[PDB]
């Protein structure tokens, strides 16, 4: 069971013994011959790659090889499959160029990447869409390989979901940067969220063109696949400050951890194969030698690759050939032209790290956000009625609006988990009607301390305390007009009349 690992020569180009010293006292049990014959990499060329692999193969009966290339030559991945095509030696790559997915491989070979498929990325995208109540979008695609699968998947998922998407027109730029139909196509976009999918240079060009059309602003949310998210330090000048794109984990999951996990996977697979029956697999005679003919009595370790666990990690490579539980983290551009990190994806949950989306400055030269009002309310009986999101299509009921609120866990603990719930009533209906005719957005929240308002020790608590402190414009709710209140904070004209009433009835 002798295997080899080719490093990246860039990040940890030192201490080959350090990699060779994995699990010193006990790595995974070391059944028979768990030994590393890892080598060093350099500038990779198909001649050099084939030469090195063929030379190593005619060595110490090599077994499954873990690849860790650092550069991004894209096509390298394909070349790797080719080797596994004509030498029955399983191989898997973890980092770098042999990380982007390739889709349909030859059914007579074994080669498993460790990246993210198109479908998983699209699913996480739609999840991040539904978790913020943005059920409207229009996507524009260039003519780039893979657009058919993307379009077909996004069309199949929308109408098989009960969320109720308002998926608008799709756009396919027949001619690139010609403005014949591209310009009018870009103009006929009345939505706010755009699911652009294209190449990096194409995306930069499209964003540069669309910036001068006003399609960017304080409310214009672009989301792009991981392909657009390329280099971690090459943010162009056409990228607006703040955009969302999922990518494979890079800040976490250090290279050593991945290498150790892969070696453990191979060792466990070999142990399971040996336990099934005692017939060790012999390496190939010589790739450089004469012709080859099929002689394997059965698939040596291909079926012994799925359904494998390792100290909690549940990597379960599918029949297509990629991991079923990728470590995907969605990232967003910061205010200092750097990639931030927000929200992981562990089992199925988004586990988002923002109860309310922060309105990000789209650009240093852009119109100020002058149409968002942070309304506030207080829980009464006939004015506002609070509820909780129902389990079925867990966004909210289609007959009300989400109102974020502050809830303290127990009494002593000040655990401020800002729960997401949706509430209806009377005043909210008028608020919706008004917002329709005055076209302003709102992220409203309930009052935290006290109820209604009172000038207690010259400081007001409740909605009055919020507005008197310039903390929240608008205080929509069952508020009574009073001279002191009018003296402190301005009011508007009334719409519903009321007053003091006496509640005494007849016993019998």
């Amino acid at each position: 069971l002798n295997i080899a690992v080719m490093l990246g020569h860039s990040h940890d180009v030192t201490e080959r013994e350090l990699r060779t010293l994995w699990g010193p006292e006990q790595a995974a049990g070391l059944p028979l011959d768990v030994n590393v014959v890892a080598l060093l990499m350099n500038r990779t060329d198909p001649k050099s790659l084939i030469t090195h692999v063929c030379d190593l193969m005619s060595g110490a009966r090599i077994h499954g090889l873990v690849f860790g290339d650092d550069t991004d030559q894209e096509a390298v991945a394909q070349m790797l499959d080719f080797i596994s095509s004509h030498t029955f030696v399983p191989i898997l790559g973890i980092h770098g160029g042999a990380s982007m997915i390739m889709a349909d491989k030859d059914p007579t070979s074994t080669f498993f990447q460790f990246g993210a498929s198109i479908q998983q990325q699209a699913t996480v995208m739609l999840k991040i869409m539904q978790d913020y109540d943005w059920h409207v979008f229009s996507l524009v695609t260039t003519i780039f390989p893979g657009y058919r699968e993307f379009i077909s998947f996004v069309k199949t998922t929308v109408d098989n979901s009960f969320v109720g998407w308002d998926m608008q027109n799709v756009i396919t730029l027949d001619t690139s940067f010609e403005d014949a139909k591209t310009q009018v196509q870009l103009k006929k976009i009345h939505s706010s969220v755009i699911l652009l999918y294209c190449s990096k240079d194409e995306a930069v060009l499209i964003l540069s063109e669309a910036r001068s059309l006003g399609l960017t602003g304080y409310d214009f949310f672009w989301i792009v696949p991981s392909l657009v998210s390329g280099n971690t330090e090459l943010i162009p000048k056409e990228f607006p400050s703040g955009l969302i794109s999922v990518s494979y984990d890079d800040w976490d999951y250090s290279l050593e951890a991945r290498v150790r996990d892969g070696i453990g996977i191979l060792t466990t697979a070999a142990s399971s194969m040996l336990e099934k029956f005692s017939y060790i697999p012999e390496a190939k005679a010589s790739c450089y030698g004469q012709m080859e003919r099929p002689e394997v009595p059965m698939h040596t370790l291909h079926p012994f690759m799925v359904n494998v666990t390792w100290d909690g990690k549940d990597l379960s490579f599918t029949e297509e050939g990629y991991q079923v539980h990728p470590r995907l983290v969605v990232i967003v551009l910061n205010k200092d032209r750097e990639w931030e990190k927000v929200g992981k994806w562990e089992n199925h949950t988004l586990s988002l790290r923002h109860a309310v989306w922060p309105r990000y400055k789209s650009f240093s030269d852009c119109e100020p956000d002058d149409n968002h009002l942070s309304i506030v309310t207080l829980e009464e009986a006939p004015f506002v009625i609070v509820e909780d999101i129902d389990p079925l299509t867990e966004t909210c009921v289609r007959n009300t609006v989400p109102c974020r609120k502050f809830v303290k866990i127990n009494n002593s603990t000040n655990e401020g988990m800002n729960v997401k719930k949706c509430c209806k009533g009377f005043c909210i209906d008028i608020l919706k009607k008004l917002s329709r005719t005055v076209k302003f957005t709102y992220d409203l929240y309930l009052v935290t301390n006290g109820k209604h308002g009172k000038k207690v020790n010259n400081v007001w608590n409740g909605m009055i305390g919020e507005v008197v402190y310039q903390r929240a414009v608008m205080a929509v709710g069952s508020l009574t007009i009073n001279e002191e209140r009018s003296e402190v904070v301005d009011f508007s004209v009334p719409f519903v009349e009321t007053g003091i009433s006496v509640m005494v009835s007849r016993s019998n």
Partner: protein
């Protein structure tokens, strides 16, 4: 590639093996994006410019 070619031609060997030769030459010359031409290989996977990069053939 030692003679800085511009476009390689490819054709089936005298003895048939369905795929055989177009896969290696296609991959290798697709590393450098050097367009190749097919002459007989009428099998359907090749017509997918995502697993073969650059490949133009002359039979449907």
């Amino acid at each position: 590639i030692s003679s800085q070619v511009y476009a390689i031609l490819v054709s089936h060997p005298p003895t048939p093996n369905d795929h055989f030769t177009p896969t290696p030459v296609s991959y290798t010359a697709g590393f450098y994006r050097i367009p190749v031409l097919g002459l007989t290989t009428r099998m359907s996977i090749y017509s997918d410019k995502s697993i073969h990069l650059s490949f133009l053939r002359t039979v449907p």
